[PDB]
Specification:
Subcellular location (chain D): Virion
Strand content of chain A: 25-35%
Structural class of chain A: mainly beta
Shape of chain A: elongated
PDB class: virus
CATH class of chain A: Mainly Beta
Number of strands of chain A: 29
Helix content of chain A: under 10%
Distance between the termini of chain A: 61 Å
CATH architecture of chain A: Beta Complex
Protein name (chain D): Capsid protein VP1
Oligomer: part of a larger assembly
CATH topology of chain A: Empty Capsid Viral Protein 2
Keywords: beta barrel, virus
Largest interface: A-B, 73 and 66 residues
Family (chain D): Belongs to the parvoviridae capsid protein family.
């Protein structure tokens, strides 16, 4: 009661091929739905057969830290980037301590808050993945990137089989109260350990060679190919068949061994509105998939390059990660209030999201006006493909539960990060309802007179990350993320005079190089 | 919760060649910056390119006892002085107990304070010197020289590379929340031990001989020197060269072996305004150094004597330690509200801050009107120099972190005291934020509704001081600091009818004598 | 990350004083007098340093 | 013998890097005539530490 | 860099080459210590004469 | 001084130095009839305590 339940453990430790990050934040949890489960749907709303949903709202909250900046600090994030070809999660240690349940009452303008010492808050971990996993969707409410900040616990809500604002019979309704949970008073605590499964290192490197440019620029090939089918000689046209062998002179015609990654073309958009086509093609123009009638737009889809060459002003309509900007709005907001990621270090293996994959024949030439070369806007597969995946970001996601089905393909989370069959389980928390003064005679009616109260406390999260040191005999210097040494009124990743932490821009992880 | 976390340990123990002082004070710590870090600078203010700054304000407080009177009592300070040639710090024991976190609320004039039993206060020690050390600067907020007094914990604030109210890229922003800290409830406590590094004893002695007066006043020297170059004989002038050997008759011309300490002349100022020159030369006249454009005045600089001979009414414009006077103001204030220290027992080795170091030749005499003897106002170095350092005072500083660079010189803190590569680390303390009642639906916006509350408690500090007994065969009595045995209405170092502790005047440490 | 002249805490004053003004303003143009003030973030170039 | 850095500096550090921009000549290499050239001198002071 | 230096006045052994007057005191180099200043004998280790 | 449109230079003779990192010097030679030792004054500090 009068004894601390835990200490403030927050720091980072660098150990050769491993790094350990520990974060601690102060949280606050209010009573949700007034201790009630509620049925929710898109019934009697803006409608739209492509936005219908059916689920439930639980009085439970949940802890989430699926954002990198929850663990690594800007400086740490830098050290990782400039010196490591890759990294991965390993172990996990979750702590919940210093439970403070506060009771609140108001009257005639007077609002006084008191301590309900004899109160409990329930906690449990869905370590069997029996409940709907909602951490895969980049939602807000995670641990504040700034340690001194205080946050609220996001409310838990799930969805089920819906048929246009109307459920089916095979739909599932889950009750979190049907789970064994540990009740904690002001002097209690809650600990939990997790072990990440074996997954490939993240690509924190950028290729030094393009898939199409691997051969030796000094030696010819012992292979030949159809050079000219027209045959020049002074007769304008005379058919004939001629062949030639590859050479540094013509690299685009040499026989390769592999092919660029898959491709699902999207529409292009210029940052300068003055350069954009008119009309509102946001929806009617965007690329989307059709799933049981209701079709959904495609966010960062197939890992494709954002822009080509110098044209750094273009970007996929919905093929890039876009983060907020502290003060940014919810609906309006212009460019100067958002941050668009630039997937560029992928142009060496993956195609460009806006342009075509390639060209394919469509007919024969038997006395027919050949050819028929048609543009390809959607590929996928083909034995021999080689591609990079989407890069992760400081404020970007971390992991995502790989849907349990009969099959999948390169289960890399399209939003970036790691795909885990068994990811860090959901940690659910809830304030125990404390009924107010009951009547003086029995009433089998559902009780509804509860004492309004909330709870606060700290929370620690320790994660051990396995690194992968770089081994390159590259002679010339490397590209490194650095801060503008120039004079400035504001220091990047700090606080303003009003005291507010702002993240200047998103940061990738691909700066060091490696031969393809 | 209902059990004391510690006792009131405050006393002194004299043990031959060692003395142990233990102090205990009651502290109070309010929430700073509303749990926020803020960017601060001299942007949009009185300007002045010599007063620009750029730093940050932390919600953290800090414990400081870098003042002698925090440990030694007036009587103790006397015993030390009258009987010891020197002394030094040895061990350190810091205790933090009886944590009392109080919660406060106000409404319609009504202000009631309550106990938040289930609350914590964070504490940690920068034992790796990773954070900006701000104890070197004689700031206020230390432990009250009077035990019964209660004090507040000073707020922590640091500065970084600034370019005229505008930072650079190489500037550093530190977050104290990124440090592992121990959280304490009402029944918890915090202990810490430190070991002072090996440093020379402080000079608690005054020389019995002047550097220029060491030789035997009864014996001549076997060395000669140019006595007269004019040659008298009745021809008014006749060149010639004559030599003579040293003698008690002429001591100022005898060959010595050493030289007085360094010197950086300052302007002189008389206590009697009527004797002072007109105008405001405080700035345009004072001595200062130029560091990257912005120049800063020089406080107690090179250890030089304050006044010479009888002229005890003069003092360096900025070469002496000046303490307040309890009721003294901040800007105005006249002589009768300040206390100026008198560095006098140093005239035997060190020069006078106001006068010149000496005279130096500036040319030859080859048929040229010699000499050229020019005054010296700045010296430093020279093999053979010997000097004393600035004396410490009862209310004066104690230690100071020696800046980590490639080199330094006699790293004695100019303000006096001891120079420590690894000084007593900074002890930072902070009230854990307790969020008020949150909404009923999620909001990823930065939380800002906190329950206002403060904390109080005691704090113990034990320090073992190594002494250095005196060994002098001096026959005649010594000078001792004593109290005016005469009748008086007020007893020195006590309290008035209104109950207020006042320190009559500053006290040096140099009373006993020792042959040079 | 810090300049020798800029180490002190930009939030706390100093318990040390120094000769602030030797001219003394009051409406008599010039009137000598001696006045002192203690260091402050307001005037860092006049605060007592250590090195 | 090296001396690893131990700084709890939050914000990124200044690092020596190569101009990622397009260029006809790669720094610290050889020209068509085969001659090694060193673009410019390089210091060693990029990382930071509290004074 | 060469060692420290505290220049002194020069004197020729041949009086005929010396400047007039008695600069022995008013010309010599000395330090000031608490009012009473004292001449400087062999001070900073400096060479006596140069070249020939 | 500087040279900004100002009649430079200003090269002034030095008659007193001392210190400066990088200095190297010899000490006074001893003589057959010369001194031998000398007690180094006990103070807070000194510099190359060669008599």
């Amino acid at each position: 009661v009068g004894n601390a339940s835990g200490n403030w453990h927050c720091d980072s430790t660098w150990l050769g091929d491993r790094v350990i990050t520990t974060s601690t934040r102060t949280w606050a949890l209010p009573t949700y739905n007034n201790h009630l489960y509620k049925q929710i749907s898109s019934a009697s709303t803006g409608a739209s057969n492509d936005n219908h949903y059916f689920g439930y709202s639980t009085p439970w909250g949940y802890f989430d830290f699926n954002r990198f900046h929850c663990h690594f600090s800007p400086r740490d994030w830098q050290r990782l980037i400039n010196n490591n070809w890759g990294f991965r999660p390993k172990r996990l240690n979750f702590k919940l301590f210093n439970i403070q349940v506060k009771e609140v009452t108001t009257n005639d303008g007077v609002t006084t808050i008191a301590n309900n010492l004899t109160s409990t808050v329930q906690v449990f971990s869905d370590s069997e993945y029996q409940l709907p996993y909602v951490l895969g969707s980049a939602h807000q409410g995670c641990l504040p990137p700034f340690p001194a900040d205080v946050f609220m616990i996001p409310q838990y809500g799930y969805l089920t089989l819906n048929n246009g604002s109307q459920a089916v019979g095979r739909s599932s309704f889950y009750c979190l109260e049907y789970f064994p949970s540990q009740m904690l008073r002001t002097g209690n605590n809650f600990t939990f350990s997790y072990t990440f499964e074996d997954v490939p290192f993240h690509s924190s490197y950028a290729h030094s060679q393009s898939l199409d440019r691997l051969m030796n620029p000094l030696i010819d090939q012992y292979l030949y190919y159809l050079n000219r089918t027209q045959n020049q000689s002074g007769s304008a046209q005379n058919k004939d068949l001629l062949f030639s062998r590859g050479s540094p002179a013509g690299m685009s015609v040499q026989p390769k061994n592999w092919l660029p990654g898959p491709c699902y073309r999207q529409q292009r958009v210029s940052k300068t509105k003055t350069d954009n086509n008119n009309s509102n093609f946001t929806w009617t123009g965007a690329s989307k998939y059709n799933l049981n009638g209701r079709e959904s737009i495609i966010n960062p889809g197939t890992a494709m390059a954002s822009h080509k060459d110098d044209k750094d002003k273009f970007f996929p309509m919905s093929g890039v990660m876009i983060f907020g900007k502290e003060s940014a709005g919810a609906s309006n907001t212009a460019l100067d209030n958002v941050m668009i990621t630039d997937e560029e270090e992928i142009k060496a293996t993956n195609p460009v999201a806006t342009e075509r994959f390639g060209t394919v024949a469509v007919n024969l030439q038997s006395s027919s006006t050949d050819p028929a070369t048609g543009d390809v806007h959607v590929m996928g597969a083909l034995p021999g493909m080689v591609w990079q995946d989407r890069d992760v970001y400081l404020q970007g996601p971390i992991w995502a539960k790989i849907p349990h089905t009969d099959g999948h393909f390169h289960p890399s989370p399209l939003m970036g990060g790691f795909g885990l069959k068994h990811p860090p389980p959901q940690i659910l928390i809830k304030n125990t309802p404390v009924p107010a003064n009951p009547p003086a005679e029995f009433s089998a009616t559902k009780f509804a007179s509860f004492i309004t109260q909330y709870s606060t406390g700290q929370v620690s999260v320790e994660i051990e990350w396995e690194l992968q040191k770089e081994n390159s005999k590259r002679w010339n210097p490397e590209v490194q993320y650095t801060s503008n040494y120039a004079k400035s009124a504001n220091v990047d990743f700090t606080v303003d005079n009003n005291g507010l932490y702002t993240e200047p821009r998103p940061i990738g992880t691909r700066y060091l190089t490696r031969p393809l």
